[PDB]
Tab-separated table of C-alpha atoms and ligand atoms in Angstrom:
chain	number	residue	atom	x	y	z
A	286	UNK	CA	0.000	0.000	0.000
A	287	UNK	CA	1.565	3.190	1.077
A	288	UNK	CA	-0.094	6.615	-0.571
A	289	UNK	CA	2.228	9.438	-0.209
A	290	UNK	CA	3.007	10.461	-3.557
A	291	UNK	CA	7.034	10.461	-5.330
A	292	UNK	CA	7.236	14.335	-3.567
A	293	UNK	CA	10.668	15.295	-5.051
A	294	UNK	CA	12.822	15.433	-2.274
A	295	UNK	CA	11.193	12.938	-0.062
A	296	UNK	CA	13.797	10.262	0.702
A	297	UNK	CA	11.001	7.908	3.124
A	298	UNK	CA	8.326	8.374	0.461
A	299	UNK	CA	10.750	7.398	-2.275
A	300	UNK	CA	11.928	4.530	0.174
A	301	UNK	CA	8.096	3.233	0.101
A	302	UNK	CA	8.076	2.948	-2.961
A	303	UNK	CA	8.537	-0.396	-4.448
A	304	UNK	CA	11.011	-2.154	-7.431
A	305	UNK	CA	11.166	-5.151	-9.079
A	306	UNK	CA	14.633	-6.116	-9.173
A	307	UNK	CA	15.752	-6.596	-5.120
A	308	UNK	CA	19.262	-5.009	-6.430
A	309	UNK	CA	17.817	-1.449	-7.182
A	310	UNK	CA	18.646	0.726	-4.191
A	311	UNK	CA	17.336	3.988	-2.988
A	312	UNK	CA	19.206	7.231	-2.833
A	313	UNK	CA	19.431	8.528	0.872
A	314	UNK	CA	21.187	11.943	0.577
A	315	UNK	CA	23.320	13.115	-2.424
A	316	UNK	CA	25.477	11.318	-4.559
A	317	UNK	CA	28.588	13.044	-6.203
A	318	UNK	CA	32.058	12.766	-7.356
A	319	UNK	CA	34.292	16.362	-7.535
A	320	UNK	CA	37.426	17.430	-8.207
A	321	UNK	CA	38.363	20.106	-5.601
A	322	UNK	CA	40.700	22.526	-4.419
A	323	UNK	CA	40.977	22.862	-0.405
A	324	UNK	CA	42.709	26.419	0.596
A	325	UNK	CA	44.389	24.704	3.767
A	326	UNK	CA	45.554	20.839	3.555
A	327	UNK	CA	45.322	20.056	7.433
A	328	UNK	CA	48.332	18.114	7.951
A	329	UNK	CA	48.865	18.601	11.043
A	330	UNK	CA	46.167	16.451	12.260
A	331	UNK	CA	47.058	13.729	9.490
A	332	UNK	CA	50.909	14.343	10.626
A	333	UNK	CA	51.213	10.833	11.284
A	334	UNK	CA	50.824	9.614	7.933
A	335	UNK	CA	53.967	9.296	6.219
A	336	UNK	CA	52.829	11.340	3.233
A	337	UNK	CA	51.128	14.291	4.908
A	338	UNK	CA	53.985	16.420	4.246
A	339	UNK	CA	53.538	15.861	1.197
A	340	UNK	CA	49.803	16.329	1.202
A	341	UNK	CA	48.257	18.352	-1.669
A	342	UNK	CA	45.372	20.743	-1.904
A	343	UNK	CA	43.907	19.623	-4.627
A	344	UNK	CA	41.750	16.213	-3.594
A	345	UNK	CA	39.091	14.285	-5.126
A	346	UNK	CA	36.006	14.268	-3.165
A	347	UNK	CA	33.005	11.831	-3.686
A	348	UNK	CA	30.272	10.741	-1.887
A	349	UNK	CA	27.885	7.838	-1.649
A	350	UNK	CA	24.424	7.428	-0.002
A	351	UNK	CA	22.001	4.598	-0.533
A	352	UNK	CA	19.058	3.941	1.408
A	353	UNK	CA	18.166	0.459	2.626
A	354	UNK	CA	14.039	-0.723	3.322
A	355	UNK	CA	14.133	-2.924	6.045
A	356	UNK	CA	10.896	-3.408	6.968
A	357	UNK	CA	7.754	-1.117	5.574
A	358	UNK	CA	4.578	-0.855	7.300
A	359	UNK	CA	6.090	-1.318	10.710
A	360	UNK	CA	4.272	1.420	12.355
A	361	UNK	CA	1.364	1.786	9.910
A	362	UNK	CA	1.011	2.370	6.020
A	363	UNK	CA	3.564	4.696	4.736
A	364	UNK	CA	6.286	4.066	7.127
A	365	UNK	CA	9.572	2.393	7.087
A	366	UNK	CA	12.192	0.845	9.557
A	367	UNK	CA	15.094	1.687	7.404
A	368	UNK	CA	19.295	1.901	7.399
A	369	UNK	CA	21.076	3.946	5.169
A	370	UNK	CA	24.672	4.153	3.997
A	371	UNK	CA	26.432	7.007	3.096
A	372	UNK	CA	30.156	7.880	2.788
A	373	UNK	CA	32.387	10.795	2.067
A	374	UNK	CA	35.739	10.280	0.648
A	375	UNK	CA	39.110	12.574	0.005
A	376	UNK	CA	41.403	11.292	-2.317
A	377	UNK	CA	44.839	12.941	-3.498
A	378	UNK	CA	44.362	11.413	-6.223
A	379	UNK	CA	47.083	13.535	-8.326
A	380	UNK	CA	49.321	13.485	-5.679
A	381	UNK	CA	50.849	9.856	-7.264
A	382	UNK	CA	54.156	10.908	-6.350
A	383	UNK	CA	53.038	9.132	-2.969
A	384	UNK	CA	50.913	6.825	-4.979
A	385	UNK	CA	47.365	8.558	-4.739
A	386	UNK	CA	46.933	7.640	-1.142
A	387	UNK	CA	43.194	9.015	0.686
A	388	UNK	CA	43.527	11.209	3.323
A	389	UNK	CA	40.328	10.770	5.093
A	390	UNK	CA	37.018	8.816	4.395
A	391	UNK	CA	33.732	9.035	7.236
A	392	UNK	CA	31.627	5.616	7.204
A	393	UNK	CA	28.228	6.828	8.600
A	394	UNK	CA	25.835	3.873	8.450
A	395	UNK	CA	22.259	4.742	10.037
A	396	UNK	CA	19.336	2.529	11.340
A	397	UNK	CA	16.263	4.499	11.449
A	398	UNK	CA	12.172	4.140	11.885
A	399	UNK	CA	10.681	6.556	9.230
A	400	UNK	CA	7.641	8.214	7.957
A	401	UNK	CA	6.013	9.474	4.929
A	402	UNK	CA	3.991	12.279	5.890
A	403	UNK	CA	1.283	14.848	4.991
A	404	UNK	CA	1.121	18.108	7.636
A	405	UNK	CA	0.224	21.702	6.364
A	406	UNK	CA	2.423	24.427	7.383
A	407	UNK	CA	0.931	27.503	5.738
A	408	UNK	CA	1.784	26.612	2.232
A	409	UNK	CA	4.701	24.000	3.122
A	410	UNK	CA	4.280	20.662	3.897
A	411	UNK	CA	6.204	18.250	6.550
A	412	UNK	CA	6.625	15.389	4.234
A	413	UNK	CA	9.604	13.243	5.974
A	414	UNK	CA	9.849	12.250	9.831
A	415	UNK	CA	12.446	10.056	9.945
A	416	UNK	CA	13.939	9.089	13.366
A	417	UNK	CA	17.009	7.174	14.507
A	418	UNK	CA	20.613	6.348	15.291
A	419	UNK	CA	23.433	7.391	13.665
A	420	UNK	CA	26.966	6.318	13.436
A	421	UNK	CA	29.865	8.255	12.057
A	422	UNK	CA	33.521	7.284	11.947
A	423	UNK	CA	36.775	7.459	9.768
A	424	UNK	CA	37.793	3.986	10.204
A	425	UNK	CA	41.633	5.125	11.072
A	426	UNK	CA	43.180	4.094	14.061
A	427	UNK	CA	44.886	5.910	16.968
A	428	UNK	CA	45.997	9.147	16.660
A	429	UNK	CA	44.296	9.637	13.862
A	430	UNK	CA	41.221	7.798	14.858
A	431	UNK	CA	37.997	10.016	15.018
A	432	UNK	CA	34.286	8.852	15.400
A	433	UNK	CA	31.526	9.996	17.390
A	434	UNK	CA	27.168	8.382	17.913
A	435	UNK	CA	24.083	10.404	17.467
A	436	UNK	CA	20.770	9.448	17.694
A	437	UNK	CA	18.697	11.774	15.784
A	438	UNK	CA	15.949	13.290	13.991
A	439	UNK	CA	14.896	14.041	10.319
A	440	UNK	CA	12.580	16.540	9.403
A	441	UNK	CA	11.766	17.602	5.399
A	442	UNK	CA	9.171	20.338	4.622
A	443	UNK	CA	8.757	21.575	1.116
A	444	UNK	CA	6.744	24.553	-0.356
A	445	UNK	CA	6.707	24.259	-3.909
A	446	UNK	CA	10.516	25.581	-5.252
A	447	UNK	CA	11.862	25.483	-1.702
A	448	UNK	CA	12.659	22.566	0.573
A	449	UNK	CA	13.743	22.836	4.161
A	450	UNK	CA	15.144	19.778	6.169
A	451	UNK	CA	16.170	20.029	9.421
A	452	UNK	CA	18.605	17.594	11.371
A	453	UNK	CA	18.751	17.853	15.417
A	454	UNK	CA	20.739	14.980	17.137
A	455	UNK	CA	21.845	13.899	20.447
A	456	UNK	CA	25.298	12.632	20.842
A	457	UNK	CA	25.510	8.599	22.606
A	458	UNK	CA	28.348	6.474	23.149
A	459	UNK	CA	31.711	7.481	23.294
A	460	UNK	CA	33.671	10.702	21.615
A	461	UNK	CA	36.906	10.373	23.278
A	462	UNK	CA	38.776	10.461	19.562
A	463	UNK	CA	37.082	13.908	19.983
A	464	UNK	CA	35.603	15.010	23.069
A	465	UNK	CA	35.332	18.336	22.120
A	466	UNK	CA	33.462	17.437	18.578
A	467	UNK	CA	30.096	19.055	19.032
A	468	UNK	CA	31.814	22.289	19.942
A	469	UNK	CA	32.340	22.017	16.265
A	470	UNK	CA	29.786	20.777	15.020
A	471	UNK	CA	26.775	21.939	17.124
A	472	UNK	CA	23.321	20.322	17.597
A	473	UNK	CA	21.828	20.171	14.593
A	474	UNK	CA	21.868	20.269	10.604
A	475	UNK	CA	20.301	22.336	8.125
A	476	UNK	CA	19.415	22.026	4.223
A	477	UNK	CA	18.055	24.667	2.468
A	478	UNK	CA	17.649	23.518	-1.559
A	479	UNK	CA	15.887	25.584	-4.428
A	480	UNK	CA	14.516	24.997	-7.586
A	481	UNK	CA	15.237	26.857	-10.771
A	482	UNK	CA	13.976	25.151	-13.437
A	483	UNK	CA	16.193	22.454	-13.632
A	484	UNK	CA	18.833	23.959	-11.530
A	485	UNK	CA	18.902	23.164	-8.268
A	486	UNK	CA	20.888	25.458	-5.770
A	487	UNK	CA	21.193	24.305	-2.397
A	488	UNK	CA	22.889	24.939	1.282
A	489	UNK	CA	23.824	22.610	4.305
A	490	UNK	CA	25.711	23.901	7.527
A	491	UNK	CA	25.978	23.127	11.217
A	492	UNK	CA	26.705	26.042	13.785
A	493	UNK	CA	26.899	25.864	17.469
A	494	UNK	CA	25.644	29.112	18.400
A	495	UNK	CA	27.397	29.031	21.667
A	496	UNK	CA	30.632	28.564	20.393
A	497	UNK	CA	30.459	30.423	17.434
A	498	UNK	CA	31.970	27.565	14.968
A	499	UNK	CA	30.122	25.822	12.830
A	500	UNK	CA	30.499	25.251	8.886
A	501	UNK	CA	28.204	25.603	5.731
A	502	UNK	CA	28.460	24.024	2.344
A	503	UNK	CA	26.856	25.727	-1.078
A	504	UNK	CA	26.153	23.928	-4.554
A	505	UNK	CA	24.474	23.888	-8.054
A	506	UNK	CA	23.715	21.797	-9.767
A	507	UNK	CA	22.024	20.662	-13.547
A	508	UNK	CA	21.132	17.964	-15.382
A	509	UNK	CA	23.630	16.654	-18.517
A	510	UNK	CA	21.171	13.689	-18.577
A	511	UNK	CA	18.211	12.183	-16.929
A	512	UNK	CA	20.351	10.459	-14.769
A	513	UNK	CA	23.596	12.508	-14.123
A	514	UNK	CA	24.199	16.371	-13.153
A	515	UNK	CA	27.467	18.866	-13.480
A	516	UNK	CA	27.521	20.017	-10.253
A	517	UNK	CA	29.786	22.974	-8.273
A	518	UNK	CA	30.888	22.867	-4.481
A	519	UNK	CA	31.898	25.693	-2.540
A	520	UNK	CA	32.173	24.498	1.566
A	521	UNK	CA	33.662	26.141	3.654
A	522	UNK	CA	34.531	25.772	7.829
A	523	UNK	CA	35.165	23.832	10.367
A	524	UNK	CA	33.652	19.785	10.000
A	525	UNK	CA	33.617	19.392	6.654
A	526	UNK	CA	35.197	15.569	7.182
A	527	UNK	CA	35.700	14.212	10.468
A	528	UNK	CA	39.900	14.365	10.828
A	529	UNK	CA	39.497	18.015	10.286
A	530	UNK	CA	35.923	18.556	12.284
A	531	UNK	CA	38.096	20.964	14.374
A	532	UNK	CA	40.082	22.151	10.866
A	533	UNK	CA	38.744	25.563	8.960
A	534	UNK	CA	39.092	25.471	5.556
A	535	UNK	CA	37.126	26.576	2.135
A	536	UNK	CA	36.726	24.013	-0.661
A	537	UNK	CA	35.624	24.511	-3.797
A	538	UNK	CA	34.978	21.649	-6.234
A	539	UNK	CA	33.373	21.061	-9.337
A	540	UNK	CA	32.350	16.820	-10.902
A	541	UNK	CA	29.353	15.137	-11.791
A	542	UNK	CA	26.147	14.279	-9.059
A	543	UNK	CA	23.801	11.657	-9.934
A	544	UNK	CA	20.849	13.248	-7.254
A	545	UNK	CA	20.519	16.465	-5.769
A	546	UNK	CA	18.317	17.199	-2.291
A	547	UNK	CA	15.499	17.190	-4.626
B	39	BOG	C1	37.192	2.354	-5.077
B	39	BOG	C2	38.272	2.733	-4.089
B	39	BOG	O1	37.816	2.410	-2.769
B	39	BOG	C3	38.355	3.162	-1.734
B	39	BOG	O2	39.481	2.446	-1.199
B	39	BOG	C4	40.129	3.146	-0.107
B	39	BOG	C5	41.353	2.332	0.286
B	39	BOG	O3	41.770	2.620	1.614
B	39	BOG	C6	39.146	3.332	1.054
B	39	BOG	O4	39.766	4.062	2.104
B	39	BOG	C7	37.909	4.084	0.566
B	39	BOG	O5	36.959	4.151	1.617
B	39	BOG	C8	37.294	3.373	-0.647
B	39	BOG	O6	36.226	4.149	-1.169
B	40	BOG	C1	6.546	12.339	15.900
B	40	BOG	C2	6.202	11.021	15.287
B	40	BOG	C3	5.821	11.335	13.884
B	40	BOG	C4	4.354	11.197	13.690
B	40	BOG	C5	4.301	10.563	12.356
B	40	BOG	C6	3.374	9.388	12.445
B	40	BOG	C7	2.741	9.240	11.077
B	40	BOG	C8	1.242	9.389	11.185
B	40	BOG	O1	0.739	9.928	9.958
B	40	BOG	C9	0.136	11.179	9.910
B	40	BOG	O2	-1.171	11.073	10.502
B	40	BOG	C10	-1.883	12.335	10.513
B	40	BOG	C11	-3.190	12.112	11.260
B	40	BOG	O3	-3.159	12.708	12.552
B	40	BOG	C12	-2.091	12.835	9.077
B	40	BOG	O4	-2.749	14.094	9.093
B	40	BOG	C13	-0.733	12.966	8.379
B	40	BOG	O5	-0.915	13.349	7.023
B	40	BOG	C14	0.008	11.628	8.448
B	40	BOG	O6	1.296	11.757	7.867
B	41	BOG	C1	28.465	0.005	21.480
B	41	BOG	C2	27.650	0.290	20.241
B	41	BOG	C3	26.186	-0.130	20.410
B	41	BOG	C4	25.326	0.465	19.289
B	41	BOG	O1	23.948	0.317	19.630
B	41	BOG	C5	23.134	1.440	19.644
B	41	BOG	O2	23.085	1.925	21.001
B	41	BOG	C6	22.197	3.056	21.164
B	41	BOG	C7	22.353	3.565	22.591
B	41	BOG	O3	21.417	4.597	22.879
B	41	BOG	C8	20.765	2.635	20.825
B	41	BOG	O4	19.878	3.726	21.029
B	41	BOG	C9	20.722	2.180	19.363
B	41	BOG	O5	19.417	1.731	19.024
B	41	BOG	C10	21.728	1.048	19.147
B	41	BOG	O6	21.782	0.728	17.765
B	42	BOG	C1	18.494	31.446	-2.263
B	42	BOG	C2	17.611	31.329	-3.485
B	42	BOG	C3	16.857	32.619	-3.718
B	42	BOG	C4	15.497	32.317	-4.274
B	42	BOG	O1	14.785	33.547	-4.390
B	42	BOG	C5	13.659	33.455	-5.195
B	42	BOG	O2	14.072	33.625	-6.559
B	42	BOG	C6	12.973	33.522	-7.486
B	42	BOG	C7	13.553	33.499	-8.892
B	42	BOG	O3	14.038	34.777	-9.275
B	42	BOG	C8	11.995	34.670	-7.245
B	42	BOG	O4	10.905	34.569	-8.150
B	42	BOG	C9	11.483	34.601	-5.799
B	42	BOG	O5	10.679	35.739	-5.525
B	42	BOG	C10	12.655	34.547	-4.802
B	42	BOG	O6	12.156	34.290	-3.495
């Protein structure tokens, strides 16, 4: 069953939704690959590596996110106990001289209890609730070993061009690869995406407004093909990837996306 329409945008609607062939996943967030340009190559914090002195600026940044139906209908038509899977990646890729080597990748895998939704906000409508935990780690290993748990929750409203989706968490578990980590990151995410015609132009940040840091992260995007979209990167702050959540930096990238936010 399940009626809440496709709703561009709506990752737990889009989840409900159902395929033929078991093997064709579902998009969680974005999925890109970009050649960028970082204007400060924290080394210091990747030190230990023996290459990081010989770190470049210029990296190749992708990022994966599939979405996994575990179990629909377990709280009612149009909802879903979930997991997702989605990973960043930097890879100094041109830096061969120490035999492309990547600096950093984050592994956040997430099992969550979702729902497709229908709730009028004055001309917007709450279309994703999506609850649960969250795990987020760089695989490395002491020093260089960072990770941190959140359980969470996932709000998307939409209002014709615009689309609003709002991300607070609670931290679980241990942070002692960094303690300090949400005075970087904060207690919540935001995504602000817009539709232009075709182009899509969108924002996602974290700020702690007590301790002023936080970081933000701008893009366009448009279609080449049905499928696949040139897309442009501009982040900049502190958090952008886990080794360098207490790092400030601006990055600007440009590649191909296969989806946007919406
Ligand atoms: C496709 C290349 O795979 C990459 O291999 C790297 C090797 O360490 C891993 O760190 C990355 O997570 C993985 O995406
Ligand atoms: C905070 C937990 C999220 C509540 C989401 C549960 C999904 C229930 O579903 C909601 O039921 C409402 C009826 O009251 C309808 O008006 C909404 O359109 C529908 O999405
Ligand atoms: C040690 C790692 C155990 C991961 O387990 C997690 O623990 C959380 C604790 O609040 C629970 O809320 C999550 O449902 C559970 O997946
Ligand atoms: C940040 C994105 C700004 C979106 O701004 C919108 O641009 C539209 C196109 O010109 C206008 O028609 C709308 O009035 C305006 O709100």
């Amino acid at each position: 069953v399940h009626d809440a329409p496709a709703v561009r945008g709506s990752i737990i609607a889009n989840m409900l939704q159902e395929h033929d062939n078991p093997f064709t996943l579902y998009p969680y967030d974005t999925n890109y690959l970009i050649y960028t340009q970082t204007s400060d190559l924290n080394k210091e914090a990747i030190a230990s590596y023996d290459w990081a002195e010989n770190a470049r600026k210029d990296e190749v940044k992708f990022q994966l996110s599939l979405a996994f139906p575990l179990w629909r209908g377990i709280l009612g038509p149009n909802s879903v106990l979930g997991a997702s899977y989605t990973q960043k990646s930097w890879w100094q890729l041109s830096n061969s001289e120490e035999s492309s080597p990547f600096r950093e990748t984050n592994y956040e895998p997430q099992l969550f209890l979702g729902f497709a939704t229908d709730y009028r906000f004055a001309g917007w409508t709450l279309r994703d609730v999506e609850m649960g935990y969250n795990h987020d780690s760089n695989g490395r290993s002491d020093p260089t070993s960072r990770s941190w748990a959140r359980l969470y929750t996932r709000l998307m409203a939409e209002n014709g061009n615009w689309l609003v989706e709002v991300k607070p968490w609670y931290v679980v578990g241990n942070t002692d690869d960094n303690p300090d980590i949400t005075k970087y990151m904060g207690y919540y995410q935001l995504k602000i995406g817009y539709h232009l015609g075709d182009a899509v132009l969108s924002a996602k940040g974290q700020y702690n407004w007590n301790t002023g840091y936080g970081g933000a992260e701008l893009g366009l995007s448009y279609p080449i093909t049905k499928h696949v979209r040139l897309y442009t990167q501009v982040y900049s702050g502190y958090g952008e990837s886990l080794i360098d959540y207490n790092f400030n930096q601006t990055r600007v990238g440009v590649g191909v996306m296969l989806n946007d936010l919406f």
